[PDB]
């Protein structure tokens, strides 16, 4: 029955990604004095399905200069890793309960970056190469600060087990304890998911399509699905880490509802930011993270190391 | 390079050597070697030239391979013994790998190919650091693990080192390459007695360090990197070239100069262990080093080579910077033979 | 040139990790603590030359605990004999080994 | 070398405490309070001897005492304990926190019928003394005789007979 | 006086660095002067990670308890009150 | 094995999607359609020529800082020791050394580009 | 087949090494290094080293990122080489795979193979220990002793890293 | 020794052979160095975990730290070589001879 | 609030550890008896298996020491079924 559980996690997540596309289109339109898609289906509900069918019934083109093996492998890696990262999340009970789930998610996010770089390099197009290099710069900018913030926050948890975050935040949200780290973490999640104002890899205005400029039909659909799934998964991680939820062991549905609502709110915030702010220059993104976020993260990491000791609040290891 | 940064890097190199010579744990010794490499690479390129970068790259590659081999040997010894302490090595394959790595770090042939190129690429001061201080840590590690060493492998490497260091120097007109090959030969002399008596290796190392410091400081004083450039020195500073001749004679091993004592004691110790053919071959092969030393002496001091007109301007001015330890280094390198019995202090 | 600065100044810079039998966090024992302790106690103050032969039994036991070469060889021989007997048809694994009995708690 | 002297199957047969982990955890504190003596004796035997074979009888005593403890529980406080261990079972981590009320019921019943008092925090972790008639193992490691140390420090130092005695040096 | 000028210039021009340095300095300093750090050490010691091995009774160990729930031995009342 | 099964399932779903995308649709591949994209006009050189990285120093420093990220991750379990004084001193030592390295590179114009 | 997950992963590790060692273009060698790092993580996790394995994967994932960028900048070529683009690279790849297959079958079939050391074909499960670590992760507790026991290692490593930043700055000054 | 030790030592041997047999690019040989470091990490971790050498489970992490230090040094040298010659090809490190 | 909650968590962890301490001696007895029984069964079946083989002592120790050595996984589960071997060797690692 574990296979049933894996399918239950996978299939609904992909449908959630599909309808997230509709939600984004409508939210941005309404924030722009427009109505998002409404013609296709009641209130635009069937637009995602039409988009998926159109993309998968569209000719996929293999670039003449492309390296076919990497060109094909990259979307597979992106989608599979995007689906994999959802596994360890406690909602409330995780599909795979790992002692070090947080480090697993960090490593898997690191692995997903190669999908963008491999896609851009294999495309053998100048714009794709520029997008891949931008992705490299983005990872260089954000990875260290992301890891340090996660370590600082998890010091109060006492472990890297995602499930134990629920117990730690039983009485209060961790955002109250670590609201600055929460802000830097939210921006870093925006950077990791390559979302505005850090949508540099794709950068339609500056790079025609970035790394996916040479991708069409199914592979592009896979890249889009990976992107949106990563958005949802990272926002869910933020909800678990900071905006904890009440869990009644006899009724998990309450925790599941609270968690889903918080993640929806965070994803809506993502779309809101994409609508509101302009895009950063990748030099500016790297400067922001290294010159502004990194020193504050180091100072706050020192603070969070000291605070449990000086306040006798060291969390239980188990 | 800011002088504060330079001081920090040199201290880091010395601290890595000190960690190698002070640690009882294999991991920390390997860490000391790694710190030595990290600090040394920028020092070799203090003056930026394409040659400096090439030398730094070659040195880095060779030393990194040596360090990886040493770590593999440590891990194998741990697998077969479970001990991290520097002591007898309990696996023969690990001992062979470790000997290869330490020889490569010391530049013992057949791992000598990098020494002359690196020495030529770097400056005279970086050359002095490379050929005097860097030798200390691998020799210390070999001395601590002398018992485990297979005598045949070490002796083969030593004899090859002597032969090659003698042969290559004959063909060299560049002072730095000459010094590199002589260093190879003297290191081959030092490692020959490592299986038998470590104190002899220490004594040879000290005499060699004194002589090499004197030679490199004299070359720095004369600002010569080629034989012809050294040839002019007689017109400007004759005393420097005369002391260079004396130091070269000591390096050749001629009695009564201090260079004789290390060869003398190494031969004595090898003979005590019934080694007669090896000492005879080593002593005879040392004559080639003597040959190119004598050729350099002929060019520098014994014969007066033609000078250039513009040297007249240099006569008026005097050397601004003084190397304080140079006279004592010369005296020790040349006039310490009457004091050999004192070889029981380091004992 | 091993300047024993640690011993001279009484500083345990790195000796704490030198052996598996030394103090470890929460008194977690090593997989061969007993053998290592016996070998260290046997070869203490007698010198390496003596210890290489007068404590060879201890060292061999320590190596056997570390690598299990002899134990693995014996197990492989037993498995080979069992497989050959099964092929010959003259051996039958007991029901408890086959899973027909509940193992002791 | 020698044959390993494995004990016979019959000797190692004992009555087994066939209760689930949740049941044991629910009664864990009172079990440690009541059955401390035999359990501590078995622990001391195990740690001193360092042989599982040597301490089989003390382990049998441990199992018997645990069975007696559970029998008294069944006689006097069965239902409250059943509810308590049912509550703990639901939690995957078998946390005590979620079952405080049922634990209170069980503790009150046990205190009344049997007089047991739950050990307080930091009590079952205390190192305790055990009085034993079993002798202390003389050589628990079965160590061989230690090699004899080298002779050392004979006496005073006097100057070398003729100095260094190195080749031609006279001093 | 000039230190105040430097601080005002820092807060105007580089607030993030001022905040980071202040937080790091407080992290360094405050734990030294905090009473509760020894409480954290004691809490970490009190945690019973490994079994409390019994010790043989030779009859000359008054302080060592002969059984839990005895008045002799360590007490955790401080943590309960904490 | 559960993690292996989940990874296999996700990878198989992605590969099946790729297969369906490359086999269900109709194709009329011709040279001009599969040529590289350069905003309508043809590319001048290759996209495999060197692309100067103006932030090389930051990348090497990123490696060196990821090492410190690795060294700092054990801190959550370190806080469980009894020698909290030494643990705190060494953790703050490592973090202050990382801060020092960042400050040095920054002041030496190392975090800047080109 | 699940009885020998470790062996399969180690063979994949050796194949990745034969991939990045035959020296294709740095991109595909980086692919090999990434695959080998993942497989090594798998092996270490199978032996009980979850933290260590995940740390290796994370560090090499970041390291190969900078390598990929550097390649596209310095180690670039107009026609990047794959393991089937040159007779030398394919020769190295085939030789490495064949050498593996040789030793693999040799040790699996023969009871005791001895290439340079002596290896026993019995599955890795044999060596594993029967003890219990209780409420602890021995790897985590040992790795955390770097701050309580390994103050000297912390000092040395921190100094090495700071001096490494300095060294990179000096080596890239370029006068 | 189990066969996994055989495979990991074989990986180290292969990486060493790769590093000692250069072709053109320097990046590939630096990758072979990093591969050797990975193989050493795996071997050390396996030994320390099988032998329950608890206080030695940190040695792999220090080995990785100094491996990354070495990698940084290698890349910082490769950048200068590329700047001075335009490529990372090893054949350009030919000024110093003998 | 986090200080209060974490202190309470430490107290509850102490409670759980004390429960484990109370239950450990019985578990140690069970484990020792089980290991000895498995070793005895292995010894007997081996006596059956290799009676024919020449110059094979049954149950001979590979250690010179006449001291108890904790059996390795192969010794206890060497001749057991594959499911038992997989469970004992990789269950905790694989369990998720």
JSON list of N, CA, C and O in Angstrom, two decimals, chain D residues 33 36 40 43-44 47-48 117-119 121 123-130 132 134-136, chain E residues 48 51-57 61-62 64-70 72-74 76-77 80:
[
{"chain": "D", "resi": 33, "resn": "UNK", "atom": "N", "xyz": [10.87, 0.80, 39.92]},
{"chain": "D", "resi": 33, "resn": "UNK", "atom": "CA", "xyz": [10.81, 1.01, 41.36]},
{"chain": "D", "resi": 33, "resn": "UNK", "atom": "C", "xyz": [10.69, -0.31, 42.12]},
{"chain": "D", "resi": 33, "resn": "UNK", "atom": "O", "xyz": [11.35, -0.50, 43.14]},
{"chain": "D", "resi": 36, "resn": "UNK", "atom": "N", "xyz": [13.77, -3.25, 41.15]},
{"chain": "D", "resi": 36, "resn": "UNK", "atom": "CA", "xyz": [15.11, -2.69, 41.04]},
{"chain": "D", "resi": 36, "resn": "UNK", "atom": "C", "xyz": [16.18, -3.71, 41.43]},
{"chain": "D", "resi": 36, "resn": "UNK", "atom": "O", "xyz": [17.17, -3.90, 40.71]},
{"chain": "D", "resi": 40, "resn": "UNK", "atom": "N", "xyz": [19.15, -4.73, 39.07]},
{"chain": "D", "resi": 40, "resn": "UNK", "atom": "CA", "xyz": [20.47, -4.19, 39.37]},
{"chain": "D", "resi": 40, "resn": "UNK", "atom": "C", "xyz": [21.49, -5.30, 39.57]},
{"chain": "D", "resi": 40, "resn": "UNK", "atom": "O", "xyz": [22.64, -5.17, 39.15]},
{"chain": "D", "resi": 43, "resn": "UNK", "atom": "N", "xyz": [22.38, -6.50, 36.16]},
{"chain": "D", "resi": 43, "resn": "UNK", "atom": "CA", "xyz": [23.22, -5.52, 35.47]},
{"chain": "D", "resi": 43, "resn": "UNK", "atom": "C", "xyz": [24.65, -5.57, 35.99]},
{"chain": "D", "resi": 43, "resn": "UNK", "atom": "O", "xyz": [25.61, -5.55, 35.20]},
{"chain": "D", "resi": 44, "resn": "UNK", "atom": "N", "xyz": [24.82, -5.62, 37.31]},
{"chain": "D", "resi": 44, "resn": "UNK", "atom": "CA", "xyz": [26.17, -5.71, 37.87]},
{"chain": "D", "resi": 44, "resn": "UNK", "atom": "C", "xyz": [26.86, -6.97, 37.40]},
{"chain": "D", "resi": 44, "resn": "UNK", "atom": "O", "xyz": [28.05, -6.94, 37.05]},
{"chain": "D", "resi": 47, "resn": "UNK", "atom": "N", "xyz": [27.96, -6.44, 33.70]},
{"chain": "D", "resi": 47, "resn": "UNK", "atom": "CA", "xyz": [29.05, -5.50, 33.47]},
{"chain": "D", "resi": 47, "resn": "UNK", "atom": "C", "xyz": [30.36, -6.00, 34.06]},
{"chain": "D", "resi": 47, "resn": "UNK", "atom": "O", "xyz": [31.42, -5.81, 33.46]},
{"chain": "D", "resi": 48, "resn": "UNK", "atom": "N", "xyz": [30.33, -6.63, 35.24]},
{"chain": "D", "resi": 48, "resn": "UNK", "atom": "CA", "xyz": [31.56, -7.16, 35.82]},
{"chain": "D", "resi": 48, "resn": "UNK", "atom": "C", "xyz": [32.06, -8.37, 35.03]},
{"chain": "D", "resi": 48, "resn": "UNK", "atom": "O", "xyz": [33.24, -8.44, 34.66]},
{"chain": "D", "resi": 117, "resn": "UNK", "atom": "N", "xyz": [4.41, 3.67, 44.65]},
{"chain": "D", "resi": 117, "resn": "UNK", "atom": "CA", "xyz": [4.55, 5.11, 44.43]},
{"chain": "D", "resi": 117, "resn": "UNK", "atom": "C", "xyz": [5.47, 5.31, 43.23]},
{"chain": "D", "resi": 117, "resn": "UNK", "atom": "O", "xyz": [6.56, 4.73, 43.18]},
{"chain": "D", "resi": 118, "resn": "UNK", "atom": "N", "xyz": [5.02, 6.11, 42.28]},
{"chain": "D", "resi": 118, "resn": "UNK", "atom": "CA", "xyz": [5.80, 6.32, 41.07]},
{"chain": "D", "resi": 118, "resn": "UNK", "atom": "C", "xyz": [7.10, 7.05, 41.40]},
{"chain": "D", "resi": 118, "resn": "UNK", "atom": "O", "xyz": [7.09, 8.06, 42.11]},
{"chain": "D", "resi": 119, "resn": "UNK", "atom": "N", "xyz": [8.24, 6.57, 40.90]},
{"chain": "D", "resi": 119, "resn": "UNK", "atom": "CA", "xyz": [9.49, 7.29, 41.11]},
{"chain": "D", "resi": 119, "resn": "UNK", "atom": "C", "xyz": [9.44, 8.67, 40.47]},
{"chain": "D", "resi": 119, "resn": "UNK", "atom": "O", "xyz": [8.86, 8.84, 39.39]},
{"chain": "D", "resi": 121, "resn": "UNK", "atom": "N", "xyz": [11.11, 12.33, 38.92]},
{"chain": "D", "resi": 121, "resn": "UNK", "atom": "CA", "xyz": [12.06, 12.61, 37.86]},
{"chain": "D", "resi": 121, "resn": "UNK", "atom": "C", "xyz": [13.48, 12.55, 38.40]},
{"chain": "D", "resi": 121, "resn": "UNK", "atom": "O", "xyz": [13.77, 13.06, 39.48]},
{"chain": "D", "resi": 123, "resn": "UNK", "atom": "N", "xyz": [15.19, 9.86, 39.34]},
{"chain": "D", "resi": 123, "resn": "UNK", "atom": "CA", "xyz": [15.40, 8.84, 40.36]},
{"chain": "D", "resi": 123, "resn": "UNK", "atom": "C", "xyz": [15.86, 7.51, 39.78]},
{"chain": "D", "resi": 123, "resn": "UNK", "atom": "O", "xyz": [16.82, 6.92, 40.26]},
{"chain": "D", "resi": 124, "resn": "UNK", "atom": "N", "xyz": [15.17, 7.02, 38.74]},
{"chain": "D", "resi": 124, "resn": "UNK", "atom": "CA", "xyz": [15.56, 5.76, 38.13]},
{"chain": "D", "resi": 124, "resn": "UNK", "atom": "C", "xyz": [16.90, 5.85, 37.41]},
{"chain": "D", "resi": 124, "resn": "UNK", "atom": "O", "xyz": [17.45, 4.80, 37.03]},
{"chain": "D", "resi": 125, "resn": "UNK", "atom": "N", "xyz": [17.44, 7.05, 37.21]},
{"chain": "D", "resi": 125, "resn": "UNK", "atom": "CA", "xyz": [18.73, 7.23, 36.57]},
{"chain": "D", "resi": 125, "resn": "UNK", "atom": "C", "xyz": [19.88, 7.29, 37.56]},
{"chain": "D", "resi": 125, "resn": "UNK", "atom": "O", "xyz": [21.03, 7.50, 37.15]},
{"chain": "D", "resi": 126, "resn": "UNK", "atom": "N", "xyz": [19.60, 7.12, 38.85]},
{"chain": "D", "resi": 126, "resn": "UNK", "atom": "CA", "xyz": [20.64, 7.20, 39.87]},
{"chain": "D", "resi": 126, "resn": "UNK", "atom": "C", "xyz": [21.41, 5.89, 39.96]},
{"chain": "D", "resi": 126, "resn": "UNK", "atom": "O", "xyz": [20.83, 4.81, 39.92]},
{"chain": "D", "resi": 127, "resn": "UNK", "atom": "N", "xyz": [22.74, 6.00, 40.08]},
{"chain": "D", "resi": 127, "resn": "UNK", "atom": "CA", "xyz": [23.57, 4.83, 40.28]},
{"chain": "D", "resi": 127, "resn": "UNK", "atom": "C", "xyz": [23.35, 4.30, 41.69]},
{"chain": "D", "resi": 127, "resn": "UNK", "atom": "O", "xyz": [23.42, 5.05, 42.67]},
{"chain": "D", "resi": 128, "resn": "UNK", "atom": "N", "xyz": [23.07, 3.01, 41.80]},
{"chain": "D", "resi": 128, "resn": "UNK", "atom": "CA", "xyz": [22.69, 2.40, 43.06]},
{"chain": "D", "resi": 128, "resn": "UNK", "atom": "C", "xyz": [23.72, 1.36, 43.48]},
{"chain": "D", "resi": 128, "resn": "UNK", "atom": "O", "xyz": [24.44, 0.79, 42.66]},
{"chain": "D", "resi": 129, "resn": "UNK", "atom": "N", "xyz": [23.78, 1.12, 44.79]},
{"chain": "D", "resi": 129, "resn": "UNK", "atom": "CA", "xyz": [24.61, 0.05, 45.33]},
{"chain": "D", "resi": 129, "resn": "UNK", "atom": "C", "xyz": [23.88, -1.28, 45.26]},
{"chain": "D", "resi": 129, "resn": "UNK", "atom": "O", "xyz": [22.66, -1.35, 45.44]},
{"chain": "D", "resi": 130, "resn": "UNK", "atom": "N", "xyz": [24.64, -2.34, 45.01]},
{"chain": "D", "resi": 130, "resn": "UNK", "atom": "CA", "xyz": [24.11, -3.70, 44.98]},
{"chain": "D", "resi": 130, "resn": "UNK", "atom": "C", "xyz": [24.99, -4.58, 45.86]},
{"chain": "D", "resi": 130, "resn": "UNK", "atom": "O", "xyz": [26.20, -4.64, 45.66]},
{"chain": "D", "resi": 132, "resn": "UNK", "atom": "N", "xyz": [26.09, -8.23, 46.73]},
{"chain": "D", "resi": 132, "resn": "UNK", "atom": "CA", "xyz": [26.09, -9.50, 46.03]},
{"chain": "D", "resi": 132, "resn": "UNK", "atom": "C", "xyz": [26.99, -10.49, 46.76]},
{"chain": "D", "resi": 132, "resn": "UNK", "atom": "O", "xyz": [28.04, -10.13, 47.30]},
{"chain": "D", "resi": 134, "resn": "UNK", "atom": "N", "xyz": [28.01, -13.10, 44.88]},
{"chain": "D", "resi": 134, "resn": "UNK", "atom": "CA", "xyz": [28.84, -13.58, 43.79]},
{"chain": "D", "resi": 134, "resn": "UNK", "atom": "C", "xyz": [30.20, -12.90, 43.83]},
{"chain": "D", "resi": 134, "resn": "UNK", "atom": "O", "xyz": [30.29, -11.68, 43.98]},
{"chain": "D", "resi": 135, "resn": "UNK", "atom": "N", "xyz": [31.29, -13.66, 43.69]},
{"chain": "D", "resi": 135, "resn": "UNK", "atom": "CA", "xyz": [32.62, -13.06, 43.78]},
{"chain": "D", "resi": 135, "resn": "UNK", "atom": "C", "xyz": [32.91, -12.16, 42.59]},
{"chain": "D", "resi": 135, "resn": "UNK", "atom": "O", "xyz": [32.40, -12.36, 41.48]},
{"chain": "D", "resi": 136, "resn": "UNK", "atom": "N", "xyz": [33.73, -11.15, 42.84]},
{"chain": "D", "resi": 136, "resn": "UNK", "atom": "CA", "xyz": [34.19, -10.28, 41.77]},
{"chain": "D", "resi": 136, "resn": "UNK", "atom": "C", "xyz": [35.11, -11.06, 40.83]},
{"chain": "D", "resi": 136, "resn": "UNK", "atom": "O", "xyz": [36.01, -11.77, 41.30]},
{"chain": "E", "resi": 48, "resn": "UNK", "atom": "N", "xyz": [19.69, 11.15, 31.03]},
{"chain": "E", "resi": 48, "resn": "UNK", "atom": "CA", "xyz": [20.17, 9.76, 31.18]},
{"chain": "E", "resi": 48, "resn": "UNK", "atom": "C", "xyz": [20.30, 9.04, 29.84]},
{"chain": "E", "resi": 48, "resn": "UNK", "atom": "O", "xyz": [19.52, 8.13, 29.50]},
{"chain": "E", "resi": 51, "resn": "UNK", "atom": "N", "xyz": [22.88, 3.84, 30.47]},
{"chain": "E", "resi": 51, "resn": "UNK", "atom": "CA", "xyz": [22.31, 3.19, 31.63]},
{"chain": "E", "resi": 51, "resn": "UNK", "atom": "C", "xyz": [23.09, 3.52, 32.90]},
{"chain": "E", "resi": 51, "resn": "UNK", "atom": "O", "xyz": [24.31, 3.67, 32.87]},
{"chain": "E", "resi": 52, "resn": "UNK", "atom": "N", "xyz": [22.40, 3.65, 34.04]},
{"chain": "E", "resi": 52, "resn": "UNK", "atom": "CA", "xyz": [23.08, 3.89, 35.31]},
{"chain": "E", "resi": 52, "resn": "UNK", "atom": "C", "xyz": [23.64, 2.61, 35.92]},
{"chain": "E", "resi": 52, "resn": "UNK", "atom": "O", "xyz": [22.98, 1.98, 36.75]},
{"chain": "E", "resi": 53, "resn": "UNK", "atom": "N", "xyz": [24.84, 2.23, 35.51]},
{"chain": "E", "resi": 53, "resn": "UNK", "atom": "CA", "xyz": [25.39, 0.93, 35.93]},
{"chain": "E", "resi": 53, "resn": "UNK", "atom": "C", "xyz": [25.46, 0.87, 37.45]},
{"chain": "E", "resi": 53, "resn": "UNK", "atom": "O", "xyz": [26.00, 1.80, 38.08]},
{"chain": "E", "resi": 54, "resn": "UNK", "atom": "N", "xyz": [24.96, -0.18, 38.08]},
{"chain": "E", "resi": 54, "resn": "UNK", "atom": "CA", "xyz": [25.11, -0.31, 39.53]},
{"chain": "E", "resi": 54, "resn": "UNK", "atom": "C", "xyz": [26.55, -0.61, 39.90]},
{"chain": "E", "resi": 54, "resn": "UNK", "atom": "O", "xyz": [27.32, -1.17, 39.11]},
{"chain": "E", "resi": 55, "resn": "UNK", "atom": "N", "xyz": [26.91, -0.24, 41.12]},
{"chain": "E", "resi": 55, "resn": "UNK", "atom": "CA", "xyz": [28.24, -0.49, 41.65]},
{"chain": "E", "resi": 55, "resn": "UNK", "atom": "C", "xyz": [28.14, -1.42, 42.85]},
{"chain": "E", "resi": 55, "resn": "UNK", "atom": "O", "xyz": [27.23, -1.30, 43.67]},
{"chain": "E", "resi": 56, "resn": "UNK", "atom": "N", "xyz": [29.09, -2.36, 42.93]},
{"chain": "E", "resi": 56, "resn": "UNK", "atom": "CA", "xyz": [29.09, -3.33, 44.02]},
{"chain": "E", "resi": 56, "resn": "UNK", "atom": "C", "xyz": [29.23, -2.63, 45.36]},
{"chain": "E", "resi": 56, "resn": "UNK", "atom": "O", "xyz": [30.00, -1.68, 45.51]},
{"chain": "E", "resi": 57, "resn": "UNK", "atom": "N", "xyz": [28.48, -3.11, 46.35]},
{"chain": "E", "resi": 57, "resn": "UNK", "atom": "CA", "xyz": [28.46, -2.50, 47.66]},
{"chain": "E", "resi": 57, "resn": "UNK", "atom": "C", "xyz": [29.48, -3.18, 48.57]},
{"chain": "E", "resi": 57, "resn": "UNK", "atom": "O", "xyz": [29.33, -4.35, 48.91]},
{"chain": "E", "resi": 61, "resn": "UNK", "atom": "N", "xyz": [30.12, 2.92, 51.39]},
{"chain": "E", "resi": 61, "resn": "UNK", "atom": "CA", "xyz": [29.63, 3.91, 50.44]},
{"chain": "E", "resi": 61, "resn": "UNK", "atom": "C", "xyz": [28.31, 4.48, 50.95]},
{"chain": "E", "resi": 61, "resn": "UNK", "atom": "O", "xyz": [27.23, 4.16, 50.43]},
{"chain": "E", "resi": 62, "resn": "UNK", "atom": "N", "xyz": [28.35, 5.31, 52.00]},
{"chain": "E", "resi": 62, "resn": "UNK", "atom": "CA", "xyz": [27.09, 5.85, 52.54]},
{"chain": "E", "resi": 62, "resn": "UNK", "atom": "C", "xyz": [26.32, 6.70, 51.54]},
{"chain": "E", "resi": 62, "resn": "UNK", "atom": "O", "xyz": [25.09, 6.60, 51.47]},
{"chain": "E", "resi": 64, "resn": "UNK", "atom": "N", "xyz": [26.21, 6.69, 48.21]},
{"chain": "E", "resi": 64, "resn": "UNK", "atom": "CA", "xyz": [25.60, 6.00, 47.07]},
{"chain": "E", "resi": 64, "resn": "UNK", "atom": "C", "xyz": [24.30, 5.34, 47.52]},
{"chain": "E", "resi": 64, "resn": "UNK", "atom": "O", "xyz": [24.30, 4.57, 48.50]},
{"chain": "E", "resi": 65, "resn": "UNK", "atom": "N", "xyz": [23.17, 5.61, 46.87]},
{"chain": "E", "resi": 65, "resn": "UNK", "atom": "CA", "xyz": [21.92, 4.93, 47.25]},
{"chain": "E", "resi": 65, "resn": "UNK", "atom": "C", "xyz": [21.96, 3.45, 46.92]},
{"chain": "E", "resi": 65, "resn": "UNK", "atom": "O", "xyz": [22.60, 3.02, 45.96]},
{"chain": "E", "resi": 66, "resn": "UNK", "atom": "N", "xyz": [21.25, 2.67, 47.73]},
{"chain": "E", "resi": 66, "resn": "UNK", "atom": "CA", "xyz": [21.09, 1.25, 47.48]},
{"chain": "E", "resi": 66, "resn": "UNK", "atom": "C", "xyz": [19.87, 0.93, 46.63]},
{"chain": "E", "resi": 66, "resn": "UNK", "atom": "O", "xyz": [19.68, -0.23, 46.26]},
{"chain": "E", "resi": 67, "resn": "UNK", "atom": "N", "xyz": [19.06, 1.93, 46.32]},
{"chain": "E", "resi": 67, "resn": "UNK", "atom": "CA", "xyz": [17.86, 1.74, 45.52]},
{"chain": "E", "resi": 67, "resn": "UNK", "atom": "C", "xyz": [17.24, 3.10, 45.19]},
{"chain": "E", "resi": 67, "resn": "UNK", "atom": "O", "xyz": [17.25, 4.00, 46.03]},
{"chain": "E", "resi": 68, "resn": "UNK", "atom": "N", "xyz": [16.73, 3.28, 43.97]},
{"chain": "E", "resi": 68, "resn": "UNK", "atom": "CA", "xyz": [16.04, 4.54, 43.65]},
{"chain": "E", "resi": 68, "resn": "UNK", "atom": "C", "xyz": [14.89, 4.78, 44.61]},
{"chain": "E", "resi": 68, "resn": "UNK", "atom": "O", "xyz": [14.35, 3.86, 45.22]},
{"chain": "E", "resi": 69, "resn": "UNK", "atom": "N", "xyz": [14.52, 6.05, 44.74]},
{"chain": "E", "resi": 69, "resn": "UNK", "atom": "CA", "xyz": [13.55, 6.53, 45.72]},
{"chain": "E", "resi": 69, "resn": "UNK", "atom": "C", "xyz": [14.14, 6.59, 47.12]},
{"chain": "E", "resi": 69, "resn": "UNK", "atom": "O", "xyz": [13.40, 6.80, 48.09]},
{"chain": "E", "resi": 70, "resn": "UNK", "atom": "N", "xyz": [15.45, 6.42, 47.26]},
{"chain": "E", "resi": 70, "resn": "UNK", "atom": "CA", "xyz": [16.14, 6.59, 48.53]},
{"chain": "E", "resi": 70, "resn": "UNK", "atom": "C", "xyz": [16.70, 8.01, 48.64]},
{"chain": "E", "resi": 70, "resn": "UNK", "atom": "O", "xyz": [17.06, 8.61, 47.63]},
{"chain": "E", "resi": 72, "resn": "UNK", "atom": "N", "xyz": [19.45, 9.21, 49.39]},
{"chain": "E", "resi": 72, "resn": "UNK", "atom": "CA", "xyz": [20.82, 9.43, 48.95]},
{"chain": "E", "resi": 72, "resn": "UNK", "atom": "C", "xyz": [20.89, 9.51, 47.43]},
{"chain": "E", "resi": 72, "resn": "UNK", "atom": "O", "xyz": [20.10, 8.89, 46.72]},
{"chain": "E", "resi": 73, "resn": "UNK", "atom": "N", "xyz": [21.86, 10.27, 46.94]},
{"chain": "E", "resi": 73, "resn": "UNK", "atom": "CA", "xyz": [22.10, 10.39, 45.52]},
{"chain": "E", "resi": 73, "resn": "UNK", "atom": "C", "xyz": [21.69, 11.74, 44.96]},
{"chain": "E", "resi": 73, "resn": "UNK", "atom": "O", "xyz": [21.24, 12.63, 45.68]},
{"chain": "E", "resi": 74, "resn": "UNK", "atom": "N", "xyz": [21.86, 11.91, 43.65]},
{"chain": "E", "resi": 74, "resn": "UNK", "atom": "CA", "xyz": [21.50, 13.18, 43.02]},
{"chain": "E", "resi": 74, "resn": "UNK", "atom": "C", "xyz": [20.00, 13.42, 43.06]},
{"chain": "E", "resi": 74, "resn": "UNK", "atom": "O", "xyz": [19.19, 12.50, 43.20]},
{"chain": "E", "resi": 76, "resn": "UNK", "atom": "N", "xyz": [16.82, 15.89, 41.12]},
{"chain": "E", "resi": 76, "resn": "UNK", "atom": "CA", "xyz": [16.43, 16.68, 39.96]},
{"chain": "E", "resi": 76, "resn": "UNK", "atom": "C", "xyz": [15.33, 17.68, 40.28]},
{"chain": "E", "resi": 76, "resn": "UNK", "atom": "O", "xyz": [14.67, 18.18, 39.37]},
{"chain": "E", "resi": 77, "resn": "UNK", "atom": "N", "xyz": [15.11, 17.98, 41.57]},
{"chain": "E", "resi": 77, "resn": "UNK", "atom": "CA", "xyz": [14.06, 18.93, 41.93]},
{"chain": "E", "resi": 77, "resn": "UNK", "atom": "C", "xyz": [14.32, 20.30, 41.33]},
{"chain": "E", "resi": 77, "resn": "UNK", "atom": "O", "xyz": [13.36, 21.02, 41.00]},
{"chain": "E", "resi": 80, "resn": "UNK", "atom": "N", "xyz": [12.81, 20.36, 37.90]},
{"chain": "E", "resi": 80, "resn": "UNK", "atom": "CA", "xyz": [11.36, 20.38, 37.98]},
{"chain": "E", "resi": 80, "resn": "UNK", "atom": "C", "xyz": [10.85, 21.77, 38.33]},
{"chain": "E", "resi": 80, "resn": "UNK", "atom": "O", "xyz": [9.87, 22.25, 37.76]}
]
